[PDB]
């Protein structure tokens, strides 16, 4: 639709403007809860990994985190022009850009892919390529859910708007066993089941 | 930190002084929505869904990043010219999908705790620099105000196992060579 906006970087108080490096960061963060019912705008002014000044919508005014930016926070509160839009950015930026998340991000569903492969005995149930990164993966052995011999790696963010996880299982092969791997995910109305049989 | 159902980063303004380089990007739940090419003045969305329904003016970045260049020279003089501590990065190489000896796949090289954001990633196949089929994402923010970058390599698995991820950073004494085969 219309052009979106972002956090407004307030101006500093100075009188105008391995190798060494000076890094300056600024993050316009926003924390939504229960849809658009509990929006919280928290802008962070960071200098060399050290956050020295921040704004909070729950507070309403700028504050200095470290003794490095009292001159910035106290000056950013004095200017009525700066504090006027900074308070209004939660409605201008976040509460507005969140409405496009419903149309795009928050409606995105991706069905994962489940494969069981031994390693030679460790069994690996690899759930791959899914969204929105909410899954419940369980290992079973003939109607009984294994737990003690199951390794669960954390969620792996692939960076391409997909996720990946690996749930492993140590086992003793007994003839007649059937090792199913349940995978519960929002995009799936019914869970994906992949089995591995004990034979020979 | 703060507990919430969703966390969006509609700033992620970056500007360092080592090499006059910057980066503007929006992030939702850890993933990058887009990044503004500060040289070509273009908004590069990371999903086709965004290119058909989203919209963003790259001028906002140039207007915003210019403020960082002012605030950078500001806090440098207030902090007695305090440099940035070179944190030690760590590399983890894995695959996007279970690799089979015939069907192609995508290799992923994750580099975490990148600070300052001056890092390189080059793939090494059998000691040679693999150039065809290499992609990397822009710097992604972390809670501790560091960064992490992910690199990719489109390949087809075979008998060749030499698939390293050369990562050179100031926090490291020697360049790291992390190779992993499923």
């Amino acid at each position, epitope marked *: *639709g219309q052009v979106e*906006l972002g956090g*407004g970087n307030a101006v500093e108080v100075c009188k*105008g403007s391995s190798p060494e490096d000076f890094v300056y960061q600024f993050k316009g963060m926003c924390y939504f809860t229960n849809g658009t019912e509990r929006v919280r705008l928290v802008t962070r002014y960071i200098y060399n990994r050290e956050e020295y000044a921040r704004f909070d919508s729950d507070v309403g005014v700028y504050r200095a985190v470290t003794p490095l930016g009292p001159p910035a926070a106290e000056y950013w509160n004095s200017q009525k022009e700066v504090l*006027e839009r900074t308070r209004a950015e939660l409605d201008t930026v976040c509460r*507005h850009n969140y409405q496009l998340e419903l149309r795009t991000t928050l409606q995105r569903r991706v069905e994962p892919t489940v494969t069981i492969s031994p390693s030679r005995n460790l069994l690996v149930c690899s759930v791959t390529d899914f969204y929105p990164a909410q899954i419940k993966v369980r290992w079973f052995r003939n109607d009984q859910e294994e737990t003690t011999g199951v390794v669960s790696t954390p969620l792996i963010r692939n960076g391409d708007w997909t996720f990946q996880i690996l749930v492993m299982l140590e086992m003793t092969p007994q003839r007649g066993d059937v090792y199913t791997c349940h995978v519960e995910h929002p995009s799936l109305q019914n869970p994906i089941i992949v089995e591995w049989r004990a034979q020979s | 930190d703060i507990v919430a159902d969703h966390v969006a980063s509609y700033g992620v303004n970056l500007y360092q002084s080592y090499g006059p380089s910057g980066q503007y990007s929006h992030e939702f739940d850890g993933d990058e929505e887009f990044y503004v090419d500060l040289e070509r003045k273009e908004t590069v969305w990371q999903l086709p869904l965004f290119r058909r329904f989203r919209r963003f003016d790259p001028q*906002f970045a140039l*207007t915003n990043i210019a403020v960082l260049k*002012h605030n950078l020279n500001c806090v440098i003089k207030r902090s007695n010219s305090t440099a940035a501590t070179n944190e030690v990065p760590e590399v983890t190489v894995f695959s996007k999908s279970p690799v089979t000896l015939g069907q192609p796949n995508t290799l992923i090289c994750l580099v975490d705790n990148i600070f300052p954001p001056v890092v390189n990633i080059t793939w090494l196949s059998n000691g040679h620099s693999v150039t065809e089929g290499v992609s990397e994402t822009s710097f992604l923010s972390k809670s501790d105000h560091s960064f992490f970058k992910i690199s990719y390599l489109t390949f087809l698995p075979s008998a060749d196992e030499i698939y390293d991820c050369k990562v050179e950073h100031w926090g490291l004494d020697e360049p790291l060579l992390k190779h992993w085969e499923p």
Partner: T-cell receptor
Amino acid sequence: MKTTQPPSMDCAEGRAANLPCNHSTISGNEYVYWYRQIHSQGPQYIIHGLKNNETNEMASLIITEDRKSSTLILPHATLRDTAVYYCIVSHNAGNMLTFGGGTRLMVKP
Amino acid sequence: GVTQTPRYLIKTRGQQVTLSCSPISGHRSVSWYQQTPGQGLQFLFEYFSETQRNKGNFPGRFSGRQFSNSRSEMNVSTLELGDSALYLCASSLERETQYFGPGTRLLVLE
């Protein structure tokens, strides 16, 4: 422009001057600004708003809850309030300032 | 308020013009505009920290400059008949509300 205004507007001196403005295509991130200007002279900032009704000591501005339209209200229109009033929208993000047709207000004494 | 000099100016073809503007004390975002009856208010370029943050679609003959004390300047080269206008100066705190100055009424004649 993303706004529209009536160009023919006059009212009696001392009485209220309600200058309307319609901006149905405005977004939740665009402010509403009002500028007046005597020709051959620099424009003058009056008042700006996003939500609710705001009042500067020069004039008041009301915005409908649906944000479709807004009106600039002058309490007691004097002879000096006879310029051309512009109603514009802005992102307040270092963007440009674009004017439209405006409203040529004439204060009949 | 916003100081802008000179007030009036009469030039001919081929000459050049250097316009100056002192913004409001505390402001450091100077925007330039050209106001004509046939083109309305057209954006020129904006200077913030001695750099050109935003720029319109005007030829290279329209250049600008800014100093440490936030005072900005604007130069035009090879003036044409269509360049005669009221050149306005908008002082802004940063990205907030812009306050215009008196303006320089320029006139180019043969």
